[PDB]
Subunit: 456 residues, 4 copies
Amino acid sequence: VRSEKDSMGAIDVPADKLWGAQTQRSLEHFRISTEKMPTSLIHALALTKRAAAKVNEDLGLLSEEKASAIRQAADEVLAGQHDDEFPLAIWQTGSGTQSNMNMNEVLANRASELLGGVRGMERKVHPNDDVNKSQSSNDVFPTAMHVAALLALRKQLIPQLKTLTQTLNEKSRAFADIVKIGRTHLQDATPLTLGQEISGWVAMLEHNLKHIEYSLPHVAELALGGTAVGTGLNTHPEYARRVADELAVITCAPFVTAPNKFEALATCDALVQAHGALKGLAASLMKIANDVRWLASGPRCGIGEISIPENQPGSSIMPGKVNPTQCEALTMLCCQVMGNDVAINMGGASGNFELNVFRPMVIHNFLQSVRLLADGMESFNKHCAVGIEPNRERINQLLNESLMLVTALNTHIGYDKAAEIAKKAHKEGLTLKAAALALGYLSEAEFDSWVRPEQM
Amino acid sequence: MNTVRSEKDSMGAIDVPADKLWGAQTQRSLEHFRISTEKMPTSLIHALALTKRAAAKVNEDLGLLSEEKASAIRQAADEVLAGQHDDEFPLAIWQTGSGTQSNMNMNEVLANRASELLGGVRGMERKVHPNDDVNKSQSSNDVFPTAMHVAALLALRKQLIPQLKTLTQTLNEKSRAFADIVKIGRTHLQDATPLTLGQEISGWVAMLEHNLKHIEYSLPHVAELALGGTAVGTGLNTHPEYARRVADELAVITCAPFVTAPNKFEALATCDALVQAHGALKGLAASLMKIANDVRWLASGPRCGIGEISIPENQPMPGKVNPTQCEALTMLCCQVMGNDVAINMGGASGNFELNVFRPMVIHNFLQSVRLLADGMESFNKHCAVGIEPNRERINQLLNESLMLVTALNTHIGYDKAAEIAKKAHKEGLTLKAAALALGYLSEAEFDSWVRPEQM
Amino acid sequence: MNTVRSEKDSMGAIDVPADKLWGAQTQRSLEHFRISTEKMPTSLIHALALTKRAAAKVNEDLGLLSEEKASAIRQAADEVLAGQHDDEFPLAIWQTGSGTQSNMNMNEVLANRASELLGGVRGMERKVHPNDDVNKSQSSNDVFPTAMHVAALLALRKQLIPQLKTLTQTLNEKSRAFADIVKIGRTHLQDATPLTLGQEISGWVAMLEHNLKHIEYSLPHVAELALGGTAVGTGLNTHPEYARRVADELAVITCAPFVTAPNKFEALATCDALVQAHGALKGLAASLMKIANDVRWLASGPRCGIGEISIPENQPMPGKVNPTQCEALTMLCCQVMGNDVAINMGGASGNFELNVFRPMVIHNFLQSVRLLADGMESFNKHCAVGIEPNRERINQLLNESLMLVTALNTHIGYDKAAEIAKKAHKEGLTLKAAALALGYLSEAEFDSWVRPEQM
Amino acid sequence: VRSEKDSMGAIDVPADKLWGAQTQRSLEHFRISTEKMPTSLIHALALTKRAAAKVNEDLGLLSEEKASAIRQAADEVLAGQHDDEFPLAIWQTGSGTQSNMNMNEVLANRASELLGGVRGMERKVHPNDDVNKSQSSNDVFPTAMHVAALLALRKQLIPQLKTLTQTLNEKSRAFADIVKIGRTHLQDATPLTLGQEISGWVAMLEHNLKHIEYSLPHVAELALGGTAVGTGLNTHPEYARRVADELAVITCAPFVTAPNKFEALATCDALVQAHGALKGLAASLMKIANDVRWLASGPRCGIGEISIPENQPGSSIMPGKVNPTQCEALTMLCCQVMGNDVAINMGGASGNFELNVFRPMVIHNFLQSVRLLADGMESFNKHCAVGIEPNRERINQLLNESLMLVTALNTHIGYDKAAEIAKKAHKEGLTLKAAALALGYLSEAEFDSWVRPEQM
């Protein structure tokens, strides 16, 4: 071990680790549960520092040898080389100071080595003086939150949603002719094509896409440039805008600086609004997943209208049993997003005066939902959605045995005789065909000709 | 009436309708809090009447209020308890977090009314005073919480619990009736090894039985009354015996095990008692939801669903019977869940000596109790009692299943049994047909060996 | 009236009160669904009237309903829209998940009424038929969702948005008025570098401005009407132009950008449009909550709190002004949060062609809109407009703070400045006193250098 | 790598890993997010198998050499030796089959080695035939859930709560004499002692203790012995009871077998009811934490009635700023438990027929809350609660400058003159003392004698 120090004294830190005193210190204070800052955030926090170092250098606030060294240290974190250099829990200070300092110390110690120097107190580059220049935990962490959010949605959620969309869209067109018995209130209703029902699913997803995209512009607003309370004290006029442009360059996202830093620092409104669209997606996905479970339920004592690919081997003496494992995993995560929304709301409404101190928790919950939904759709798509095939024999068996097709004989034999054969088919226990044929109202040629399900 | 009388509070005079018993403050609140349509529920109003009534009796016993004046306020409260002054409480839920306005509302209505019993009149020439007399040795801070717990305990004891016990007995009766009816099991929504309908139903009986215990465990805390702590909970300007005396009184009138809160600061600063109690409600809600969905799915059809059971047709496609009672119950179960969240936010939002989110908490709590109570009641008499088994179809499903293949193991061996099942599946045949197709056993043997009664 | 007439549906005859316009089904539902006190809100009833009205006009144009009979049903609907038949809709929220019973309720009330306009009477001798005439080319499945979105869009457009814009303008006005008033900042609840009150308030203005956009983005989806899909969404037994014609009609009467849902299956099988819309509401709720708490904390006191601002005294300890409007707003913000959860559970609980949790969803959605609407309105005219700064106290806090120590840096150096602050803290002195105690600067220099206007 | 196989074919599994085919198979199907089965559960799942192996042996269903080998393999998992042998995500099948098989394969491969045999297909001990004897994922996973739950509450949550209780209880008695200005509606109210206010906190915690303990008896019910649908098919009559007794022995908990296995398999009622008490605790903790933040807010522009120990160093030029970091971390996790309740409720109500398939998610959320709350109270206790000391000078300054003490002069000078001096003290801008002294109503000797805050 080596001795690190701050304004509170010296503290022993692992020799083989790049963090400093404050990280080692908060490590024995905030020892709560096992949740830590997710990779996507760590990278976003590194990107934030990288951009800030570039801007400081341009204003002459930093030397080239320093700024460049920091940028190179950041890029290493982005390359997954210092993943074990961030041991801080999510359950820390609400402003995320601990995590900011954590990134600062690790980034400073490494930049020192890259400059021929060494890690520790004799470091060439300084965490607060160099890496944390013209900024504060108050305005850095909200920025890292938005940078990680927009990118996670654009790079992960959106793509997976489109993929699942086109897949179900293909299925829609594919099964356009297959007609099946409808169902409202879990009861037998008027028929509709299996392709139209799936078209309901694709439409839902397409709606959620636009609803998610509507929330992006707000999440694009960066707080960097406001500092401690949002006034922008101790900064250059062009700083706020410049750090936003640099961010837009290296991430390729339409990042802009928040019009009002006071709104950015004291709230999480962008993430409360964006996550509102996510729970809306979870709601949609919950049904689409359930319709599959049910339609595919069976193979003998359920609905069994469709068939989904089997993933796990299962029993040998029971070859028919195929559990909707992909849907079960999908619905569970949908309950999870629903529950995460509450946690986020409670945190998003608990801000006070100049700063909201429920941030680490919000970003924790938000990013989890994006991972869950994004991975959930990809997993559902490949291991289920694409393998959906209709059980045509079972579909027709249920359509013919149904009593809803009596509606076609109303514009032929009348409402009196039509409802007469149906009430007799139900009461006794048979089909409509044999019911009308026995009453002498129609013949096998007449029934099969007039009762056409393909014409609704 | 277009005609109005001129009552007044510490801020000035205000026109109150001449045909109403409320005073200057209830009218001033009405014009400052016009938000939505929710008004304080009657169950809570009666709880307020009872609190004021209990206070009068005690104040009399402790010689703090004249007999003639105490009996007037007492008599006025009973009037409210008889459903005579329900239109005298217009104030919405969205008001002062302490429920001061509704406390004043009761004080004024009771003042003006009691004055008319003593021969006097309503208005400024009152013989009975709202704050001085009726709100004697009280505080809207310690009174409201009391009304809340009084309203909450009686709604649970005299409404919810009885209905919960009734539905249970019904379901328990059904379990024995269908104790021999064997039916296909379903895990992950797929066919599984069999079990009798009585067993599937006994699982519901056991759930409700567990909910009773959970709900009973949450009563002792709700029974704790805050009446006695006044302003900040120290009981300043009140009689030493007052708190225990009024708690005993309320206990005698309502026949409920009411006790005075052992710590007033916890009673005045939080809604914890109800936050824990509703936790039991959101539990039963989750339970009922499962019981409701199982019923409608098992009764789905009549041709393209499961259709193993039959439910009574209450509402007016010859055999399309919509499970409407299940839809009402499942809809309200979602409601109880959402209410829990609002109660949590409120119950956790208290500051220092007083939680000021009470009106919102009691509104959601009492609504949930009405829902779960009335929900189980109608679900019972309009569905649970008429549940009949579709023996014919249930048996048709057992035969067409492949899950009964295990019965052939002890007779012909797992491998042959497995083959039979694999064939029956690939070709879409019954275990009977497939077994006969390979010639592994005769029909006279299948109909003996695979005896579904053994599960 | 004790007297009753004898109406009847497909199940038999039932006694309906002779003084009521509803029929056999609305009465049968009433006796089968006695759960709680919640009834369909008037805002939704008028939405139903408008849907039926729109249907009549279109059915007439498409020659499916006789002129004399269409104008009667149309005239009867306008009657409801004028607040003349509010007591004719007793059915509770907890009913059929599709809202069929309330659809029938409107059909029967409109039938019996229209019959009286054509000279005929109510009851079985009707000249106008409930289902046949009024529910022409419709389905309670595609009608209810329409009424929901019609009720939802108008409540947002004609109520919520206007009030949101008003509060914003008020707050925006206040921001400019206090643009020069410097005050101590507070992060983590601790004193921080300064900022003017105008800036602290401009943060609220910006929040509400953002909420407007978010709420506006959620309107296009709510505008999609399901009317035209009938039973399962295929539009069986309906005119090809019907769907677009009725959508245009509704758009003309309400002046709202209503359009027919591009996909009926998504419209009939889910409540997604409202699930996404309420997501915007729970957002504004979270925003208002912050705006409400900031106000009451800044006005807390008058002696032992922060007390930087003053709020109008609406309710009647000489200077104890309780922030009641903040308490009503914060209480309802919790309510909107809990409602979101119930909407989520319902909106995610749909099966196949139809979601049967609609009554519960619209109840919570419309309540939230009333709350947020009426909440911002009263909060504005009874608080937001009267917000006054306590210049004297605000200045007293700036001086007694240590956060202004940074102004001494460019003049005497960080180290000396740090020392001054460390001393002032240890001994409990003002930066002035401590600076003078060490003799690092004169008073004539402190009062010049540390100029709070620079932040 | 080595080749493992099931009824679905061979699959390459890491040579250096103990799991089998089904684990390696579900590893590439259920690739969702980063959440995995928490240690406490893995141990509970191992304990379940250990107990089951002991019981099977007693009934003669298993040989001693096998049962004993399995028990030894389990004890190694419990000793944190195979922590990396469980890579399966939480987002899998709702019955937890994957995780059960995962435990089976890892436990079987190891037991084989312990028997002189080797890992792989040539294993001496078999996962399904030996380790998973007389049981199924349907009845094993719910048991592992309850075993981990009761133990987590008894061994972790309860103790931390008592510790925090006695600490605040000590503070209560300690500050019993110190009187402070009361506060209702955030406004100045009648006085009360600082010790009484803290007594409100201790009372809240004491209530939550009993409310948590009331939920334990239900969580003590085990499902083992019901199997697939709860009928107890393919088992010995004494099995169900015996596996429950064995569980009670090795864990030292009052574990009993569920009276009705149908209730145990199709619901999560015990955990929905138990977590109801947890959110009730989170609610209590939220306020207790907030009162501290506020009371300690300042040091000059807030309330500042109390002082809490400083953890992180902070700035040098701003020695007064002490952020309530411990409370911020505590409130965040309280929002988290609140949000977790919703996720659990949604999952606990979504069961169908004979089995609830939202289990992995529920146990995930439940166990997180227990960790959060338990660690949160310990962290709050040591790094804050114990260091709470009153700022007596600031407390009195605020008590004297208050206008609420005018109530004492009512039973002396009258309600007329008392309210007269107060209305003048407020209006002009001074204390009650100087206000009454200037009006000639009282003297310095009279005021300081009659106005006694210690007598309320």
